[PDB]
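Inputs:
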Amino acid sequence: SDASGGIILIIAAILAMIMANSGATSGWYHDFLETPVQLRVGSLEINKNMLLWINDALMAVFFLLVGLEVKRELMQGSLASLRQAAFPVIAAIGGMIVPALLYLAFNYADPITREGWAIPAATDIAFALGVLALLGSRVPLALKIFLMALAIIDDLGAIIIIALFYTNDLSMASLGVAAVAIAVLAVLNLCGARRTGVYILVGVVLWTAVLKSGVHATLAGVIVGFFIPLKEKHGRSPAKRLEHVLHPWVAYLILPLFAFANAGVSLQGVTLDGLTSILPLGIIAGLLIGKPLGISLFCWLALRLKLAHLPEGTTYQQIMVVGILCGIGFTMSIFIASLAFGSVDPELINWAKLGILVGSISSAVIGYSWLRVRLRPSVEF
Amino acid sequence: SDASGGIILIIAAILAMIMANSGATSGWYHDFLETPVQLRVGSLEINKNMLLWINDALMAVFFLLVGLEVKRELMQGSLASLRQAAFPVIAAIGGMIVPALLYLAFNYADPITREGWAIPAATDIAFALGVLALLGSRVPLALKIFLMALAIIDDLGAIIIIALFYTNDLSMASLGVAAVAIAVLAVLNLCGARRTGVYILVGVVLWTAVLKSGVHATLAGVIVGFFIPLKEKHGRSPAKRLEHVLHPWVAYLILPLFAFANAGVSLQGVTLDGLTSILPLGIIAGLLIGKPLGISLFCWLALRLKLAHLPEGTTYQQIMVVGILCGIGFTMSIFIASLAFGSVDPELINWAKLGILVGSISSAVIGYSWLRVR
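Outputs:
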C-alpha cells in the first residue's frame, strides 16, 4: 500500500506548493510556518519556530521506526549475515561519496555552501517506493530490499556524520541527562521489560534532553528503536509489533504532513531563470548523476571484488535504474538542508529546495521511463 | 494486584511527606513543585506551575480510564440494567449530599470556604481498594463492584458540577475548537474507526483547547473515553483493550507520581494544634461522618423504597462499613480542593490537605478494624 502512501505524499507536497503559491493562502501558510514558539519554565527558555518543532517531532518518530527496522535487518534480515549485507553496504558508501563529490567539485571552496555536501547523499524512501509501487506486481522483492537498504544506510549515515559535526551547542547538563537516559534504556533492556511504553517514555526524556539539536533529537528516536527488545520470547515481539503499528502512521500521517509543511515554496513570488547557482546545479549533479553513477559503479566494483549481489535483479539493467531511483532525496534532502543551513541561512534552504525538487522529479520520471520497459510483463488473459 | 497498587501509592505519599518535611529535601521539593512553567507561541502565552501541568495531564489520563470504565458499566455492567444500577446510584447522591451538608453546616456562610463544599464528596478509589485488597480472598466481588460504582458516581459527579460552576474563564475560540474536536470524535465514532490512536489525538486537541481549565482538561479525558468504540465487532474491543493497557500505568505510575507530588506537606515547618478551623473540622465531619451516614442511610432508604441491593453483601453490617470506606477522599479530595481553591488561595489548600489526610487515614483505619471481624 506504499502506492497510496506515495500518492498521498505527492498530493500533500503538491498541495503544499499550491498553498505556498496561491496569493490567498501563501500568506497564512508562511505566517503559520514561521510563527514563533517558545517555552519558558521559570528561568528555562527554549524557542524555535513551528516548523522546527514539527520537524524535530516528525523526524524523531520516523527515525524511531528506522531504528526498529535497521535493528530487525541487523539481526534477522538482509543485514544479519555478513554475506548478503556486503552488497547494499558497498553500494551505499559509493552512492554517497559520488553525490557529494559531484556537488563539492561544483561547490569548490565556498565555506558557507560546502556544508551542504551531505544534501545529495539523501534519498526519499517514500517517493521511491511510491513510484515503484505504481508498477504493481511486476516488481521483484530483491529490488525493494536492495533499495530500502541503500536509502537507510545513506540517510542514517548522513544523520550520524551530521550528528558528529555540530556538537559545540549541546550543554553538559543536557548531555548528562542524555547519557543517563540512554543508560536507563540499557538497564531497561538488560533487565528485559516487555512493556515498550517505558522505553518510549525514557525515549522522550532523551529527546527533550537533546531537543536543542534537531540532528540529536532525531538520533534520539534511533537510539530508542535500537534499545527496544526484539526477541519473540514472549510469543510476540515488541519491536516488530510496534513497527507494525507505526508503519501506517508514518506513511499516512507523518510523511504527508511533513511534505505539506516543508515542500511549499513560492514560485509566483520569485522565479529567476538562472538556476546556475552553484547550489542548484551542484545538487542536481549530485542527485541526477552522483547517485546513479555512485551506486552503479560501486555495484560493478562490488561484483568484481569477490562480493556477489542480491539475487534475481539484473545487475546491468536494473541495478543502474535503482541507482537513478536513489537520486530522489526529496523529503530527506529537505531535512538535511534544513539541518546544515537552518541556523546559517533561510535562503539557501529555498534554493536547495529548488535543486532537490528538480533532481527528484527528474530522477523519478527518468527512472520511471527506463524501468517501464524492463519489467518482464506479467501477462493477463 | 490493587494491593501492591495501594502500598505503592501509600509509599509514594509517605515518601512525599518525608520529602516535604525533612529540611535537606523540603526546599528542592517546593522549588521544583512551584517552578514557573510558561509556553509562548508568537503572541500566545500560557503559564502555570509545574504542579498544575502535572495535575492536568495526570487527571486527563485518569479520567480517560474512568470514561472508559463508566461506559463499560453503562452498557455491559452493573450500570447497564436499570435494576442493578438503582442501588449504587441512590447510595451515591446520598453519599455526596450528607458529606457536603456536614461540612456546610460547619462552614455556614463563608463565601471563600463555601466553595470547597464538594471536597468531602470525593473518594480515593486506589486507597480504598488498596486497603480492601489487604484482606485477600475473603472479600466478595459484589462489595468491590458497589464501592467502585459509588466512587465513580460521586467523583465524576463533583467534577461535572465543578465543570458547570466556573465557565467565566473559557474563551470563545477555545470553546469553538473544543466543540469541533468533540464533533470530530462523534463523526469518528459514527463512521466507526477501529484505530483508537486517532480518537486519542483528537482527544489531545480537545485537551489542549480547554487546557486553561483543570476541570475541563480533566473532563476532556472523560469525553475521549466516552467516544471510543466499545463493540466487540472486530473480534476484539478497542475500549476494553485500551482500558486493559491503561490499568497498570495509572496504578503504578500515574497515581504514585501524583501522590508523590501533591501529598507532601510541611509539618515540622508549622503544626498549630488548633485543627478547629472550619475547614479541617468541617471536612473531617464531611468524610468520617458525612460519608458513612450518607451511604448507609440512603441504602436503608434504598431498600425500603422498593429498590433492592447488590447480592450477597450484608446490608446492616458490610454496607455501612463500605460507607466508612467512602470517607477516604485522599487523592480525589486533594484534586477537588486544588480545583476550588487553586486560583483563590495557596493556604486553604494545605489546611484542606490536613483535614482530608486526617479524615482519610482515620476512616481507613476505622473502616479496617470493623471489617477484619466481618
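Remarks. The interface with chain A takes residues 35-42, 47, 50, 197, 249 of chain B (CB under 8 Å). The first helix of chain B runs from residue 2 to 21.
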